[PDB]
């Protein structure tokens, strides 16, 4: 499989990250359209996804992160 | 598991017990509004990943239930 890209518009958009990630796919997500606090929310949700499945989380830049399955 | 949260770092206690297959009940009365939001988002992430159940018990009490 190949990395799923996501352009986030709201916190509900975390469902795309969650859905693809729990299906065993790496997700790269952009938060440039998100506010300071919305990005904080996304990162906390993504951290939760990662911890539960023992995956890897990495910062690419200030508005881009990736969640990688175990 | 009745976790009293002091900061966002205590998310690890919820996470650790939950991914080990245990239901966790956590209290957020000591947290600021910003910290409680962070905990709820993290807990939502834990639940979504493992298809668990998340429920609000009262205003400062939530539960995360596996499988």
């Amino acid at each position: 499989s190949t990395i799923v890209p996501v352009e986030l518009h709201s916190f509900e958009d975390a469902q795309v990250i969650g859905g693809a990630f729990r299906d065993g796919d790496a997700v790269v997500f952009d938060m440039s359209l998100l506010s300071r606090e919305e990005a904080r929310r996304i990162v906390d949700f993504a951290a939760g996804l990662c911890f539960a499945l023992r995956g890897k989380m990495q910062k690419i830049d200030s508005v881009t992160f990736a969640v990688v399955p175990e | 598991v009745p976790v009293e949260l002091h900061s966002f770092e205590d998310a690890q206690v919820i996470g650790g017990a939950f991914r080990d297959g245990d239901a966790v009940v956590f209290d957020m009365s000591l947290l600021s509004r910003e910290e409680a939001r962070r905990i709820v988002d993290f807990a939502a992430g834990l639940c979504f990943a493992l298809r668990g159940k998340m429920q609000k018990i009262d205003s400062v009490t939530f539960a995360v239930v596996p499988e």
Binding site: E12, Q15 | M28, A36, R37, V40, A44, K56, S59
Partner: peptide, 10 residues
């Protein structure tokens, strides 16, 4: 204490 379970977890 105005927080709830995100809707999409239903």
């Amino acid at each position: 204490d105005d927080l709830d379970v995100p809707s999409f977890l239903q």
